[PDB]
Structures are given as structure tokens and as C-alpha cells.
CSV table of C-alpha atoms in Angstrom, one decimal:
chain,number,residue,atom,x,y,z
A,1436,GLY,CA,31.9,-36.5,58.0
A,1437,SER,CA,33.8,-33.9,56.7
A,1438,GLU,CA,32.1,-31.2,55.4
A,1439,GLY,CA,28.4,-29.8,55.2
A,1440,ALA,CA,25.5,-28.1,54.8
A,1441,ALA,CA,27.2,-24.6,54.0
A,1442,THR,CA,26.1,-21.7,51.3
A,1443,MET,CA,21.9,-21.5,52.4
A,1444,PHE,CA,23.4,-19.4,55.1
A,1445,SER,CA,25.1,-15.5,54.6
A,1446,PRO,CA,28.2,-14.6,54.2
A,1447,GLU,CA,27.7,-11.7,56.6
A,1448,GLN,CA,25.5,-14.1,59.1
A,1449,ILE,CA,28.5,-16.7,59.8
A,1450,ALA,CA,31.3,-14.9,59.5
A,1451,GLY,CA,33.7,-18.1,58.8
A,1452,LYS,CA,32.2,-20.0,61.6
A,1453,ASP,CA,32.3,-23.7,62.4
A,1454,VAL,CA,29.1,-25.6,61.4
A,1455,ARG,CA,28.8,-28.9,60.6
A,1456,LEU,CA,26.6,-31.8,58.9
A,1457,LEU,CA,25.3,-33.9,61.6
A,1458,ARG,CA,23.2,-36.7,60.4
A,1459,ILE,CA,20.7,-38.5,63.4
A,1460,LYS,CA,19.0,-42.4,63.1
A,1461,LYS,CA,15.3,-42.0,62.4
A,1462,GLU,CA,14.9,-45.0,64.4
A,1463,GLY,CA,13.9,-44.9,68.5
A,1464,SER,CA,11.7,-41.5,67.7
A,1465,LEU,CA,13.3,-38.8,67.7
A,1466,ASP,CA,13.0,-37.0,72.1
A,1467,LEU,CA,14.4,-33.6,71.5
A,1468,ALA,CA,13.9,-30.4,73.4
A,1469,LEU,CA,14.6,-26.5,72.0
A,1470,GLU,CA,14.5,-23.5,73.5
A,1471,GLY,CA,14.9,-19.9,72.4
A,1472,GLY,CA,13.5,-18.6,69.3
A,1473,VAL,CA,11.4,-16.8,68.9
A,1474,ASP,CA,11.1,-12.9,71.3
A,1475,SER,CA,13.3,-15.4,73.5
A,1476,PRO,CA,16.0,-13.8,75.2
A,1477,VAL,CA,18.1,-16.4,73.8
A,1478,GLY,CA,17.7,-15.1,70.0
A,1479,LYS,CA,18.0,-18.6,68.4
A,1480,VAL,CA,17.4,-22.6,68.2
A,1481,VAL,CA,19.3,-24.1,71.4
A,1482,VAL,CA,18.9,-28.0,72.0
A,1483,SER,CA,17.0,-27.9,75.2
A,1484,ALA,CA,18.2,-30.8,76.7
A,1485,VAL,CA,19.0,-34.1,74.1
A,1486,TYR,CA,16.3,-36.7,76.3
A,1487,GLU,CA,18.6,-40.2,77.0
A,1488,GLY,CA,15.3,-42.7,76.4
A,1489,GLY,CA,15.0,-40.9,72.2
A,1490,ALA,CA,17.1,-41.4,68.9
A,1491,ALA,CA,18.6,-38.2,69.9
A,1492,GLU,CA,21.0,-39.4,72.4
A,1493,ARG,CA,21.8,-42.2,71.2
A,1494,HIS,CA,23.3,-40.3,68.0
A,1495,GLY,CA,25.2,-38.1,71.1
A,1496,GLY,CA,28.1,-36.3,70.3
A,1497,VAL,CA,26.3,-32.9,70.8
A,1498,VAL,CA,24.3,-31.9,73.7
A,1499,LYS,CA,21.9,-29.1,74.7
A,1500,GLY,CA,23.3,-25.2,74.6
A,1501,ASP,CA,24.2,-26.6,70.9
A,1502,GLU,CA,23.7,-23.8,68.0
A,1503,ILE,CA,20.9,-25.6,66.0
A,1504,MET,CA,19.5,-23.3,62.3
A,1505,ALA,CA,19.0,-25.6,59.8
A,1506,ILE,CA,17.1,-29.1,59.9
A,1507,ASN,CA,17.2,-31.2,57.5
A,1508,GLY,CA,18.3,-28.0,55.2
A,1509,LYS,CA,15.4,-25.5,57.3
A,1510,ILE,CA,16.8,-22.1,57.9
A,1511,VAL,CA,15.1,-21.8,61.8
A,1512,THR,CA,18.0,-18.9,62.6
A,1513,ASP,CA,14.4,-16.8,62.6
A,1514,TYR,CA,11.7,-20.0,63.5
A,1515,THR,CA,10.0,-20.0,66.6
A,1516,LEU,CA,10.0,-23.1,68.9
A,1517,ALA,CA,7.0,-24.6,67.9
A,1518,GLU,CA,7.7,-23.7,64.2
A,1519,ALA,CA,11.2,-25.3,64.5
A,1520,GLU,CA,10.0,-27.8,66.5
A,1521,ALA,CA,7.0,-29.0,65.0
A,1522,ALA,CA,9.1,-28.9,61.8
A,1523,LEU,CA,12.1,-30.6,63.4
A,1524,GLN,CA,8.6,-33.5,64.8
A,1525,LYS,CA,7.0,-32.9,60.6
A,1526,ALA,CA,11.0,-34.0,59.8
A,1527,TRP,CA,10.9,-37.9,61.9
A,1528,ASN,CA,7.3,-38.3,62.1
A,1529,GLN,CA,8.0,-38.3,57.9
A,1530,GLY,CA,9.1,-42.2,59.0
A,1531,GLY,CA,12.6,-41.3,57.6
A,1532,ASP,CA,15.1,-43.2,57.6
A,1533,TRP,CA,17.8,-40.7,59.0
A,1534,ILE,CA,17.6,-37.3,59.7
A,1535,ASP,CA,20.2,-34.0,58.8
A,1536,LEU,CA,19.9,-32.2,61.8
A,1537,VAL,CA,22.0,-28.4,60.6
A,1538,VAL,CA,23.8,-27.1,63.8
A,1539,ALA,CA,26.0,-24.3,64.5
A,1540,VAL,CA,29.3,-26.0,67.4
A,1541,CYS,CA,29.1,-24.8,70.4
A,1542,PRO,CA,31.0,-26.2,73.9
A,1543,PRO,CA,29.2,-26.4,77.1
A,1544,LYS,CA,30.3,-23.4,79.6
A,1545,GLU,CA,27.0,-21.5,80.1
A,1546,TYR,CA,27.5,-17.9,81.1
A,1547,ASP,CA,25.8,-14.1,79.4
A,1548,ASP,CA,23.5,-12.0,81.4
A,1549,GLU,CA,24.3,-8.5,82.0
A,1550,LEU,CA,22.2,-6.3,82.2
A,1551,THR,CA,20.3,-4.9,85.8
A,1552,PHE,CA,16.8,-5.9,84.0
A,1553,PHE,CA,14.3,-3.0,85.0
């Protein structure tokens, strides 16, 4: 809708950020890929890909490269792939009706390179 989740986080974390609360129907499985988190080069949770053959795609709106932070109301800003990945799963697994994914906004651009890498 208009407003969503915006408090669980810190004031020095969001910083008048632009986050939304998307709700996906728990129909046709989840089928979602994640990448980053843990000690990754990302340092956050970003949708790896939205399986066209899942409930993720069905919804639409957001796509890979997103900025996942909370899952059904579960701070994953410091969560690991597995943790998050699994976590999210658990939710869907539960067999609910819908799932509220808390992910920030971010258009598909892709551009990050600044390190001679040893």
C-alpha cells in the first residue's frame, strides 16, 4: 500500500531510505534465489533471481538486484545466505496465505568495480 515496515531498523540504518512492503501470495511455492550476505562481496541480501516458475515472478514489481532486509518481519540485514534463504523458506514452508517481503527499492543498473584485487 502506501506505508509499510519502517521502524524495526535503526535511524542511522534507513536514513530516510525508500523501502516498501511487498506482499506475495503463498501459492505455487516460493522459488526464489538469494545472493550476498555473510562475508560476501555484497554485504547484504539481494534477490539473485526471480524464478519465472514461482510465486515470486507471479507477483512481479521488484526483480533481481533488490535490497532484501526483512523477510515476513525478520531482520536479515546481518543474516547469511543460508540463514535468510532458509528463513524465507521456513515462512513459505509454513504454508501461509501470503508473505510480506521487506526489501528496499533499487533499479537494475549494475555497476560496482573499484579494487585491483591484490
